[PDB]
Each structure stands twice: as structure tokens, then as C-alpha cells.
Amino acid sequence: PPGGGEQEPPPPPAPQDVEMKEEAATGGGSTGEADGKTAAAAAEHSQRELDTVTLEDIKEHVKQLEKAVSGKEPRFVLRALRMLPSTSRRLNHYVLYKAVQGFFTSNNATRDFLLPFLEEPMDTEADLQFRPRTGKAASTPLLPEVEAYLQLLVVIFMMNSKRYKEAQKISDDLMQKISTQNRRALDLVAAKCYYYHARVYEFLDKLDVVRSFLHARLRTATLRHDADGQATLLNLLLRNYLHYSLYDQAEKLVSKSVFPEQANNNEWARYLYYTGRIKAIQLEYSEARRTMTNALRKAPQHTAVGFKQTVHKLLIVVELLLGEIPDRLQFRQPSLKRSLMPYFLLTQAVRTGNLAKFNQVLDQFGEKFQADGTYTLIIRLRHNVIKTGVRMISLSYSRISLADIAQKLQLDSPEDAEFIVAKAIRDGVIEASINHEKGYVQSKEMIDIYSTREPQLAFHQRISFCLDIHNMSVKAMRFPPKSYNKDL
Amino acid sequence: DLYSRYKKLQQELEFLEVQEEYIKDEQKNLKKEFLHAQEEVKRIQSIPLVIGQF
Amino acid sequence: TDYAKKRGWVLGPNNYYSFASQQQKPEDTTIPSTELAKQVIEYARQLEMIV
Amino acid sequence: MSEKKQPVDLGLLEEDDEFEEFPAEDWAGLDEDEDAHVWEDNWDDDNVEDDFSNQLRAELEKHGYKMETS
């Protein structure tokens, strides 16, 4: 009784100041920032709100707060209500209601007052004037707080929060398309909503509702968008298409439209991993290699570690198809290390390529990579072994023996040697000379680079493409200084 | 007012439009003038001269 | 039978012959010098358009 | 979003809950020889090492016997 009883009212009185100061700082900062001209100043709170969201993703917020700390839940915004002029007595009220809970105690509870959150959104959310931005700035931050701990029958409470979200703003909207900074906020805000109860969705249900409406809301923007939030709404569609769609006459190349200015400094990376994951099933060797390795190298801001094990793991999964498999070399973090701790014996078992042993080795300790689903690219790997090994033979000498290298490829016949080597010949990835003088098969095996071999035409295209990248980077150092000198 | 704001505003679109090629003309001409006065104050600096001491 | 009318190649003395294989004469370098000149035009453009 | 990092990290906590500090200490048996040694070299050394961990690891002791026999 004295241990936690003496340290009980101590620890708590500490996130109160930073959360109230935070909601007054970004609330009064957002309203007090874009209040006069919201249409002139745009997206200044874009990075602010998302950095507060990623700042509160690692909240250790509620650990003990089920027991008599729940006074923060019935309290809310309460700024300048019931009359748009004459808010001075409400400036008194701001200190008053915060001071009422600070005299002795408060009658508090957790799960009772959830459903009448629409009492103020019926008449006045904040002021009767800035109702959209104050409505979303009021409701949308506090809904992941109470609808955190998605488990333990808060899924139904999440459904209540869903129908409240749609019911006040995103059933259609209050004015269809706000066409301001909170329209541009409401894109990724409504998206973030749909990601947040997308766990509720895939938890028991599947694709069959708001996702089907999200094409209509995806095109209700009119098209005149920059389509950043439209792309974020596309990302939940494509992640919904990851687990089971497999049809390619719509999303593959059909969904592929204008390719708008879709940046976010995250959405290139995760959008590109998503389209590389779905473009990874046809075994893309040129494109998804470089650009999916690029999407690995993007998003450095928060972590380069915890998520890029997936684009990394899939990346090396499709890299060992080509015969040349680079391991984890330049990045040191013990998350990808434990990620490849099962994968290491088999990815080193790629290059030597011993059939009967490594066939037993894969399924032998195969637990999670073969429990990862349907054995597809490993079942292509199982006969890609001799193709990458014979590609190492292509990196070795020319003539093919009937005992030495045929026995070495575990493949002992005159027919299958030239036959499957010829299956490497019909690829075109190699250079070989099919000749029979006595029956032995030659190859010129010329891996001579273009150094003194048509160089002008060769790095011709390198000059044009590289100068276009460097010179559009010159555009990228022209225009943001215009975005510097614009205000002054 | 409300529907007149469109066609009233279109004239402001055109008047802000006309500043584009104008600022192109200034930005192309005054740097040529800058190398005019730059080369002209350069050719003041001629090599026959007297040497003093500081 | 079918491949003599499908391929339409030369059928030699008990051998299968391969022609038109890496026979190509390289370019004159003149037309790619013209498109490189167009690249120089577009370098004067992209380097100096807004100026 | 970076909130889809959360179920992937729940998968990571299941991976760390597979073996609890059995691979950190046992693989730290190799890391204590491998810590602060540049791991780009440990991929080449791990490459030819794991290549010859099966057979003919040292093998330079055998080449003197390969002289008269080959």
C-alpha cells in the first residue's frame, strides 16, 4: 500500500502537460496559422501533423490509466462554443473546466461515454464557422486514442467510430469537396482512418464495402488533384490486392494512370514496394531489381531497419534468381540479421547449387519461409538451381565435357548437357557459339565490355539519361529556391 | 458577385499571365546588361599603371 | 517439310545452315551525330530556357 | 503510414519469441570473432569459409601430397 500508493499521483501528472500543450500547440497553431487565409498558406501543418502522428506512434501512453485516470476521456476541445462572437467568458471557461477537475477529484469511467460524441457536432463543433477544420481537428486525433487497444470488444466500438467518422464528414462530406488545406488534409486523414480500421476490416471481414466505395471517393476528387492522397487511397487498394487478387486486367497496367506527383517522402518507397511485390511474381530481373533496391534505400527518416527487412527479404529472394546474390553487406542492424538467420544457409546454398543435398536442406528446416505461403519462388528456385549453377558455368570456361563438367553439374548424358545448356542459349543473357566439329560444343564466351567496342553508341544513352537526371536535379535546385524567395 | 467572381477573376488571371513573359524579358535582358557593365568596369582595369605602397 | 516452307532457309549437304547471324555492318555515326546535335540543342534548352 | 510497421514488428516479436537469446549468444559466438571486423570482408571470408566449411578447408597441407600424385 505505501509503494504504489505514494508514487501513484506522481508519475501520471506528466503526459498531461505534453498532450494538452501539444493539442493547444497544433490546434491553436493550425487554426491560428491558416485562420485568415487557409487557401494561401497550404500544407505547412502537413509535416507537422504527420510528425506528431509518428511522434505518438511510440506512445507508452496507457499502461495503468484504466484505473481512475480516465478523466481525460470525457473532456475534449470545448473551444469557443455556443456563440461565434463574445468568447471572452469562454476564455475564462478554458481555465474553469480544467480547474474543476483539479480541486478534489472527478467522477470518471472508461467505456460509458463513447456514443454521445456527436452532441457538439450536431449544433456547433467549435465555432459554427471553421466547422470542417475544427471538426476533423477535434474528432480525428482522439479516435485512435479511445480506439487504441483494438482487441477486447473495441472492434465494435471501432464500428461506432467508423459510422461517426462517415456520419459527420466522410459519408460524402459536409461540403462535398472542401477544396482547402483540410481537404488536402482530409485525403490522408480519411486514408489513415481507413488504414486504422483496416485491421478491424481484415480482422474478420475482407474486401466488400468502404473499399468498394473508395474507388468512387477515389474519383470524386474530380481528377484535377495532385493525387497525393489519391495515391495513398490507392495504396490500401493495392495492399488489399496483395493477399489475393491475382487478376491483372485492371490494377496491373490499368490502374497505371498519369503517375502523378506522388511524393510524401514515404509513398515512393512503400508504393514502390507494393507495385514491386506484385511485379515480383512474373520474376522481373531488370526493373524491380534496381527500383525495388531503390525503394529499400528510401525512407531513411524514422527507421531504415524495422520495415525494410520485407523489401530486403523479397529483394534478395528475387536477386538469387539471377545467379548473383549479394548478401547483407553494408547495412548493420540486428533485425535484418535475425530475418536472414534462417535464410543464410540456403542463400549460401544458392551458388554451389548441389541438387540432392540442398533440396533436403530447404524443406528440412523450412518452417517460416515455407510457411510464408504456397512455396512459389522457392519452387521455381528448386529448378533454378541448375540454371544459376550453369550460369556460373557460363562464368567459367567454354567447352563442355561429358565427364568433368557434366558430372560436376550432376548431369550425366550427352543429350541433356547440350540440351539444357541450349536452354541457357535460348535465354539470350549469355554469349555462346554452338559448334559441332567432332561433337564437342564450343562457345566463344566473349564477355568483352564495350571498352574499345562501340563506345559512343554505348554510353551515348548513358550521357543522355544521366544528363537528364542531373539536369532535372538542376531544375530541382532552381525551383525550391523559388519556393524560398516566394514569401520575401 | 458570386457568378460574376468567375469572369471578373479571369481578367486577374490574364493580368497575372502578362507578367510572365515580361519577367522573362527582364531576366534575359538585365543579365546581359550585367555583363555589359561587368565587362565595361573590367576594361577600366588596364595593365599600364603606377605602383604605390600601402 | 513444313520448316522448309516455314523457315525458308538453305538446306545443305546433310547439314542445317545458319545465315544472317551477326552479319550487320555498323552505323555511319552521322545520324547519331545529328541526334547528338539535337541533344546539344536540348542542352542549350534545358540549361538555358528560363535563364 | 508506418503503422503497418506495427504488425510486421509483431511478427518480429514472434521471431524474437521463437528463441529467447539463444541465437544472440550462440551467434554471438561467431560475432565475438566477427565484431568490429568489417563485415564486407566477412561476406567474402564467410563466402569462401562456408564454401570450404564442407570440404578442403585448409587444404594447403594437402597440396604437398598433390605434388607427387598430380
Side-chain angles (χ1 to χ4, degrees):
Chain A
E6 285 174 352
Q7 296 181 0
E8 183 73 27
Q16 178 180 4
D17 297 330
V18 300
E19 287 292 329
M20 287 176 65
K21 179 66 176 177
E22 184 65 32
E23 67 184 2
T26 57
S30 296
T31 63
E33 187 268 330
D35 53 356
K37 295 295 289 183
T38 308
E44 295 87 6
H45 292 279
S46 65
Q47 74 279 13
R48 298 290 178 266
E49 285 179 352
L50 68 88
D51 283 330
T52 54
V53 166
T54 60
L55 189 145
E56 71 195 1
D57 200 3
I58 319 104
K59 284 290 283 183
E60 205 69 29
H61 184 74
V62 47
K63 63 180 74 64
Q64 196 178 2
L65 278 72
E66 295 293 326
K67 291 184 179 293
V69 196
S70 67
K72 268 64 180 296
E73 299 176 356
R75 76 174 182 86
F76 59 97
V77 178
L78 287 90
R79 305 288 287 176
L81 270 304
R82 187 76 277 284
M83 191 175 177
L84 176 60
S86 297
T87 58
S88 297
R89 295 178 179 89
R90 294 168 181 83
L91 294 169
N92 296 318
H93 282 91
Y94 296 155
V95 184
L96 286 173
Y97 76 92
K98 297 178 189 294
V100 170
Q101 295 182 356
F103 290 111
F104 287 162
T105 46
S106 295
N107 296 113
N108 296 321
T110 64
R111 297 177 185 270
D112 196 2
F113 181 70
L114 183 72
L115 301 172
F117 285 177
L118 301 181
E119 187 268 329
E120 297 298 328
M122 282 302 293
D123 192 3
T124 51
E125 282 82 5
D127 54 356
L128 186 61
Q129 183 178 2
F130 293 105
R131 291 174 67 188
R133 58 187 294 167
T134 59
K136 62 185 75 173
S139 296
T140 64
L142 52 81
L143 293 166
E145 285 189 353
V146 183
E147 301 301 327
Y149 286 162
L150 188 148
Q151 305 297 321
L152 282 79
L153 59 87
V154 190
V155 172
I156 300 167
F157 286 168
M158 187 57 216
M159 189 72 206
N160 296 114
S161 294
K162 289 175 190 178
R163 67 172 63 86
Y164 290 164
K165 286 161 184 66
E166 286 107 18
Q168 66 188 355
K169 63 181 185 296
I170 47 171
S171 269
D172 120 295
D173 207 354
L174 67 90
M175 61 186 77
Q176 46 35 296
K177 193 67 71 176
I178 317 291
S179 70
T180 53
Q181 190 179 4
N182 54 358
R183 183 263 195 102
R184 290 183 292 275
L186 180 61
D187 300 334
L188 53 91
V189 166
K192 182 182 69 66
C193 162
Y194 293 156
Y195 301 120
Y196 189 75
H197 55 75
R199 294 182 182 92
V200 165
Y201 283 164
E202 287 180 353
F203 187 75
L204 60 97
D205 286 330
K206 63 182 177 67
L207 163 56
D208 278 80
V209 84
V210 180
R211 307 171 179 183
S212 291
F213 176 71
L214 195 142
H215 305 285
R217 191 177 174 87
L218 188 70
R219 287 184 174 275
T220 194
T222 331
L223 275 66
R224 299 293 185 270
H225 239 279
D226 190 75
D228 194 4
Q230 182 171 0
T232 64
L233 293 174
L234 186 146
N235 291 123
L236 68 90
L237 295 177
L238 206 151
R239 187 187 65 81
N240 191 10
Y241 295 164
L242 190 146
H243 69 277
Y244 184 78
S245 285
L246 283 71
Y247 56 90
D248 296 337
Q249 70 271 16
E251 73 275 20
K252 306 296 287 185
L253 295 173
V254 223
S255 27
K256 26 249 90 288
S257 294
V258 192
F259 286 166
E261 294 179 355
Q262 296 175 349
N264 201 8
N265 294 123
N266 192 0
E267 195 175 6
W268 286 111
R270 55 182 61 196
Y271 165 76
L272 208 154
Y273 169 68
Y274 289 163
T275 186
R277 177 70 177 90
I278 308 299
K279 282 190 288 185
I281 198 164
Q282 74 273 19
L283 282 71
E284 180 66 30
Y285 290 160
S286 180
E287 188 268 334
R289 179 74 172 87
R290 56 168 181 80
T291 193
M292 186 168 68
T293 313
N294 195 3
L296 183 151
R297 289 188 180 95
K298 299 301 185 287
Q301 295 86 16
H302 192 275
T303 56
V305 174
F307 184 74
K308 308 300 178 293
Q309 62 186 3
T310 315
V311 63
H312 184 74
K313 182 176 173 65
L314 184 73
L315 179 61
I316 52 95
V317 159
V318 306
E319 280 177 354
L320 50 82
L321 303 175
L322 287 85
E324 298 294 326
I325 175 65
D327 288 331
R328 186 187 62 82
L329 268 65
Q330 64 184 356
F331 286 166
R332 179 186 60 80
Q333 56 267 10
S335 298
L336 279 70
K337 291 178 72 67
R338 291 179 179 91
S339 300
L340 194 142
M341 277 180 182
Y343 207 83
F344 183 73
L345 184 62
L346 68 95
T347 193
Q348 189 62 256
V350 170
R351 291 171 176 171
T352 59
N354 197 0
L355 296 171
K357 300 291 187 180
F358 294 151
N359 194 1
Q360 186 59 256
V361 170
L362 295 170
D363 196 1
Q364 182 65 40
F365 64 95
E367 194 270 331
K368 186 175 174 65
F369 62 95
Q370 79 181 2
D372 201 2
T374 63
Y375 55 85
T376 59
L377 195 53
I378 190 166
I379 213 72
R380 297 187 186 95
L381 178 59
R382 282 182 61 248
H383 288 179
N384 201 1
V385 168
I386 198 65
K387 186 165 72 66
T388 58
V390 82
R391 189 171 297 167
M392 187 62 207
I393 299 301
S394 71
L395 297 172
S396 177
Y397 298 95
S398 174
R399 309 291 182 90
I400 179 162
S401 178
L402 195 147
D404 288 331
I405 202 160
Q407 181 184 0
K408 189 177 75 66
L409 292 173
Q410 294 88 21
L411 183 141
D412 47 358
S413 176
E415 291 86 3
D416 58 358
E418 192 271 332
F419 186 74
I420 299 171
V421 162
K423 300 299 178 291
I425 289 167
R426 64 181 289 276
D427 298 331
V429 298
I430 48 93
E431 172 166 350
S433 172
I434 304 98
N435 294 313
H436 294 88
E437 181 70 26
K438 64 189 76 63
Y440 290 167
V441 179
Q442 283 74 12
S443 70
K444 56 188 176 294
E445 67 170 2
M446 182 179 284
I447 318 171
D448 180 73
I449 58 176
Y450 66 91
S451 297
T452 66
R453 187 63 177 169
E454 295 292 329
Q456 303 88 16
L457 191 147
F459 61 92
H460 181 275
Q461 57 180 355
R462 176 66 181 173
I463 286 165
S464 67
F465 285 162
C466 84
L467 281 174
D468 285 329
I469 296 299
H470 301 107
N471 201 359
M472 74 179 286
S473 301
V474 170
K475 302 296 182 183
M477 66 173 283
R478 284 169 187 173
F479 190 78
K482 272 78 175 176
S483 296
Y484 159 61
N485 207 356
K486 58 177 283 183
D487 57 354
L488 54 92
Chain B
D1 285 329
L2 196 276
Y3 197 73
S4 175
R5 184 172 64 192
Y6 183 76
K7 193 176 287 183
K8 177 69 175 178
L9 185 56
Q10 296 293 320
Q11 187 175 1
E12 183 176 357
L13 271 67
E14 294 174 351
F15 187 79
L16 193 61
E17 187 272 331
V18 76
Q19 306 302 319
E20 289 290 328
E21 191 272 332
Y22 172 61
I23 201 68
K24 300 293 182 294
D25 290 331
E26 281 181 345
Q27 76 180 356
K28 72 179 290 185
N29 289 316
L30 275 81
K31 60 173 67 174
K32 297 188 290 291
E33 298 176 355
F34 179 72
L35 54 90
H36 273 292
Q38 177 65 40
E39 287 176 350
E40 281 169 352
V41 301
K42 179 64 174 66
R43 62 186 289 267
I44 298 302
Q45 289 184 353
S46 296
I47 309 101
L49 55 84
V50 66
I51 292 96
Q53 63 185 358
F54 193 79
Chain C
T1 300
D2 175 72
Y3 293 159
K5 301 294 185 291
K6 180 180 178 182
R7 294 295 185 183
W9 293 356
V10 291
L11 185 62
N14 199 2
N15 192 358
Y16 289 165
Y17 284 163
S18 174
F19 58 93
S21 297
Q22 298 181 0
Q23 196 182 4
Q24 293 301 111
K25 179 170 70 178
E27 291 290 328
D28 201 5
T29 65
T30 60
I31 298 170
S33 71
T34 61
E35 76 189 3
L36 277 172
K38 295 178 182 180
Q39 291 189 5
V40 171
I41 294 167
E42 291 179 352
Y43 292 157
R45 178 180 173 92
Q46 291 180 358
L47 281 175
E48 298 89 8
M49 172 56 71
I50 294 96
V51 187
Chain D
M1 287 78 77
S2 297
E3 295 183 355
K4 298 180 183 181
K5 294 182 180 181
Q6 288 184 355
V8 179
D9 289 335
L10 291 174
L12 286 184
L13 291 176
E14 289 182 352
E15 292 180 0
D16 296 330
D17 284 327
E18 289 178 354
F19 287 157
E20 286 290 325
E21 296 291 323
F22 262 161
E25 291 177 353
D26 291 331
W27 287 101
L30 278 77
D31 292 331
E32 68 178 1
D33 289 330
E34 196 176 0
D35 195 2
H37 295 99
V38 176
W39 293 268
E40 191 270 331
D41 187 74
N42 291 313
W43 170 68
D44 286 328
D45 196 2
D46 201 356
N47 194 1
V48 176
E49 187 269 330
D50 198 3
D51 197 0
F52 291 165
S53 64
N54 192 3
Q55 286 295 110
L56 60 100
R57 183 181 62 80
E59 177 60 30
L60 270 69
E61 298 172 354
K62 190 180 177 181
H63 289 92
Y65 295 153
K66 290 171 68 177
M67 293 179 185
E68 67 273 14
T69 63
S70 297

